[PDB]
């Protein structure tokens, strides 16, 4: 007694499901004497009490119906008089592909990390499709990306799902963005598609290590440089981002003579001076720089500094004699007084040269670079002239020349 | 003429240097006659008048005087007297392993990534030794550990410097903190050493993704939860630090079927509901579930939540008949209407039993399960009562059971 129909949706108005006064029994010459008339909740079909055909009444759309079940059914009840009966009608309502995928957004944005290897699966956000059966298997397909492939697995229902899968190591000093296209194609008549773009963003990874502009930082400063001044400025280069590019400097492998001395900026890589210089004390200094990033990564380089002489110290004058007493009678060239001079700056700075100021009966003897003998030059007498103020005077030859004055008084005995 | 001397150092006062009277063809029959000094700015030696020797007279440290120079010589000059002369002394001090080596700080500390390959190299602080010579080379020696070892390699001078070598990867996880000792050792006699703490701390590396404690949460709830209930809650266990351990909780590949209906809480991980749940709607969700942390790592599980059906549907009544029509010549068991039952809810909240309250002259004959007949099961008079007003109760069999009444009017014909 039940009888089932089967009609595609979303058909217009008037069309027809069946001849449910045929396919009953029903013959026409009392057919509107029974009143055949269409009891439901939600009016979708309608019977012509003139022919007993059954025909649609609104439109019959699937999706509003069942949703996504497999199988979608109508059934209601037919009501026939003299006698009152029941008739109980399925209709089931196939599913035409009238409704194209739909991703969640049209732009989607995936972080991925430099050191993602090649092969490494991402998965992506399947599209919904509101139709069922083969109107809703979805076929994926990626534009193509020397850097990006798809592949497309199964479900255990039969459904697809698309993952991004990575052939080509990315590097994102090198490109940090990659724009792809993503397309979902069901397998229905008509074949309706539609199209999402994916952002990739290549995350950074600390895979840079610090590098120094320069492998050797040589520079030559003067020993009078004040504390403070700049000397140098060490330069580190990281192409990474954020965290793995900001670099530190900082001394390695120094002792307490030069830490008192140099001081190296933590962050603008800048060399200044907190000592003070002496070329006498040491003439060249061999500091050791590290550069750290955030992601401990060590770069390693030597920093030279020359310390070039000049003339800050004075040539000092020492004597010695024999209780700086003479003879009257003494021989011409008798030694009366030794002198010993040295300047402690070096090259030409160093070099000394003796002269005797005054007037005196006496005259200087040079014997090596840096001892002189004060001998006798002329006629003494105690009654005459008892003692003499020798002044012994050395000037070095730098540049401006420094100079000292040493008198000593030497005694006529009689 | 000139002439040197080699003494070691630290020697006490009064040790012998050398003979400088005979030395330099002095006769001690005319010594005291001449009057031997020794003039220097420093006073480090003296000599007796009495024997012609040179000796020391203070702490003669050559670590004060030249110290890290290769060679530690002190030139000062020696007068006599009748006649006044000059003579240059040369003393060579020689270096004695009388100072231990010293490292910069007795604790020092190393970050270490988790990420350091099996030989990576590390830089290490080197000791200072204020001596020279065979008494400055430094040997340098690591307490045996599982997992670091110690290279020692050369500079272009011969001076040693130690480097950390690492021979088992390092994992945070099973030990943060690694307790070394550095001890460095001088080439001298005696051979004097000193010793270092280096305490290594594994940096944390983003290595352990993410990991569910279930690989599947099933929960079933009722239709009637009200919104914002709690319905379960994910938790996934991330064995890093810091960020690499902050996990985001966050639904994949979802609809706005589910997105209008539930919320993941994106640090606690507590699924609750911003909708109203439906058994007549949906029955059962399934989510996906993404843990994602500061690496980048994504974790994949996936909830399955059941819907339990309440009877929160009641039973409605469809009737029909021929125009509330009843002739009343009608025989017994005459159809006067048709009702028809259908309950929203499944199982025994969807089955119905239909009653007939009140009194009349007709009875209820049911034919399915959904379709019952009235018919006529008594007499019929217009004269006597021309209508009749038949009250339908259909009442479901569920917990607490819900009904529904439907009356209509009969009238009698004549
Ligand atoms: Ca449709
Ligand atoms: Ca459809
Ligand atoms: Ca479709
Ligand atoms: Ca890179
Ligand atoms: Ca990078
Ligand atoms: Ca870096
Ligand atoms: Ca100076
Ligand atoms: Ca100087
Ligand atoms: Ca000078
Ligand atoms: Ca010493
Ligand atoms: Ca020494
Ligand atoms: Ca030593
Ligand atoms: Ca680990
Ligand atoms: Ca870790
Ligand atoms: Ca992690
Ligand atoms: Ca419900
Ligand atoms: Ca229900
Ligand atoms: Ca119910």
Redesign the pocket.
């Given at each position: 007694e039940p009888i089932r129909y089967a009609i595609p949706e979303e058909l217009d108005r008037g069309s027809l499901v069946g001849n449910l006064a045929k396919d009953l029994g029903f013959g026409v010459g009392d057919l509107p004497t029974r009143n055949l008339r269409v009891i439901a909740e939600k009016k979708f079909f309608t019977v012509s009490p003139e022919n007993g055909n059954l025909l649609v009444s609104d439109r019959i759309d699937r999706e509003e119906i069942c949703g996504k079940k497999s199988t979608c059914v109508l059934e209601f009840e037919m009501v026939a008089e003299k006698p009152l009966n029941f008739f109980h009608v399925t209709v089931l309502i196939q599913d035409i592909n009238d409704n194209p995928p739909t991703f969640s957004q049209n732009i989607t944005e995936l972080e991925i990390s430099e050191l993602a290897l090649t092969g490494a699966t991402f998965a992506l956000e399947s599209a919904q499709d509101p139709d069922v059966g083969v109107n809703s298997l979805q076929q994926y397909y990626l534009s193509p990306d020397p850097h990006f492939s798809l592949i497309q697995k199964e479900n255990l229902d039969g459904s697809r799902y698309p993952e991004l899968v990575l052939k080509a190591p990315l590097d994102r000093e090198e490109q940090p963005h990659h724009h792809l296209v993503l397309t979902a194609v069901d397998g229905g008549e008509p074949s309706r598609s539609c199209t999402t773009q994916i952002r990739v963003i290549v995350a950074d990874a600390n895979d840079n290590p610090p590098v120094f502009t320069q492998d050797m930082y040589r520079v030559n400063v003067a020993?009078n440089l004040p504390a403070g001044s700049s000397v140098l400025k060490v330069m580190a280069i990281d192409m990474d981002e954020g965290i793995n590019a900001e670099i530190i400097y900082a001394f390695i492998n120094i002792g307490k003579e030069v830490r008192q001395l140099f001081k190296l900026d933590s962050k603008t890589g800048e060399l200044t001076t907190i000592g003070e210089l002496?070329?006498?004390e040491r003439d060249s200094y061999t500091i050791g720089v590290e550069a750290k990033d955030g992601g401990h990564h060590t770069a390693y380089c030597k920093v030279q500094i020359d310390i070039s002489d000049?003339n800050?110290?004075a040539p000092e004058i020492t004597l010695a004699s024999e209780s700086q007493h003479i003879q009257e009678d003494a021989e011409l060239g008798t030694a009366v007084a030794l002198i010993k001079t040295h300047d402690?700056?070096s090259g030409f700075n160093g070099e000394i040269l003796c002269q005797l100021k005054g007037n005196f009966p006496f005259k200087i003897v040079q014997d090596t670079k840096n001892t002189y003998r004060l001998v006798t030059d002329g006629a003494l007498d105690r009654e005459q002239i008892p003692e003499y103020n020798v002044t012994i005077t050395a000037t070095d030859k730098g540049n401006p020349p420094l100079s000292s004055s040493k008198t000593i008084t030497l005694h006529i005995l009689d």
């Amino acid at each position: 007694e039940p009888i089932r129909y089967a009609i595609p949706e979303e058909l217009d108005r008037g069309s027809l499901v069946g001849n449910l006064a045929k396919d009953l029994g029903f013959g026409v010459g009392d057919l509107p004497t029974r009143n055949l008339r269409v009891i439901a909740e939600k009016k979708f079909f309608t019977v012509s009490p003139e022919n007993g055909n059954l025909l649609v009444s609104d439109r019959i759309d699937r999706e509003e119906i069942c949703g996504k079940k497999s199988t979608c059914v109508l059934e209601f009840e037919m009501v026939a008089e003299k006698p009152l009966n029941f008739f109980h009608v399925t209709v089931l309502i196939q599913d035409i592909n009238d409704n194209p995928p739909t991703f969640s957004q049209n732009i989607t944005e995936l972080e991925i990390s430099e050191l993602a290897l090649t092969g490494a699966t991402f998965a992506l956000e399947s599209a919904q499709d509101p139709d069922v059966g083969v109107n809703s298997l979805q076929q994926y397909y990626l534009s193509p990306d020397p850097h990006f492939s798809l592949i497309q697995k199964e479900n255990l229902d039969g459904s697809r799902y698309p993952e991004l899968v990575l052939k080509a190591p990315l590097d994102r000093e090198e490109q940090p963005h990659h724009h792809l296209v993503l397309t979902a194609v069901d397998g229905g008549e008509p074949s309706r598609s539609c199209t999402t773009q994916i952002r990739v963003i290549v995350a950074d990874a600390n895979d840079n290590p610090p590098v120094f502009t320069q492998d050797m930082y040589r520079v030559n400063v003067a020993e009078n440089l004040p504390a403070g001044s700049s000397v140098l400025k060490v330069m580190a280069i990281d192409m990474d981002e954020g965290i793995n590019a900001e670099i530190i400097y900082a001394f390695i492998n120094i002792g307490k003579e030069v830490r008192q001395l140099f001081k190296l900026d933590s962050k603008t890589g800048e060399l200044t001076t907190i000592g003070e210089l002496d070329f006498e004390e040491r003439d060249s200094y061999t500091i050791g720089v590290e550069a750290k990033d955030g992601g401990h990564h060590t770069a390693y380089c030597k920093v030279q500094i020359d310390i070039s002489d000049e003339n800050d110290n004075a040539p000092e004058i020492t004597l010695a004699s024999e209780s700086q007493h003479i003879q009257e009678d003494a021989e011409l060239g008798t030694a009366v007084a030794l002198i010993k001079t040295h300047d402690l700056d070096s090259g030409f700075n160093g070099e000394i040269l003796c002269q005797l100021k005054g007037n005196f009966p006496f005259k200087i003897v040079q014997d090596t670079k840096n001892t002189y003998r004060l001998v006798t030059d002329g006629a003494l007498d105690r009654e005459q002239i008892p003692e003499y103020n020798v002044t012994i005077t050395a000037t070095d030859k730098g540049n401006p020349p420094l100079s000292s004055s040493k008198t000593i008084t030497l005694h006529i005995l009689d």
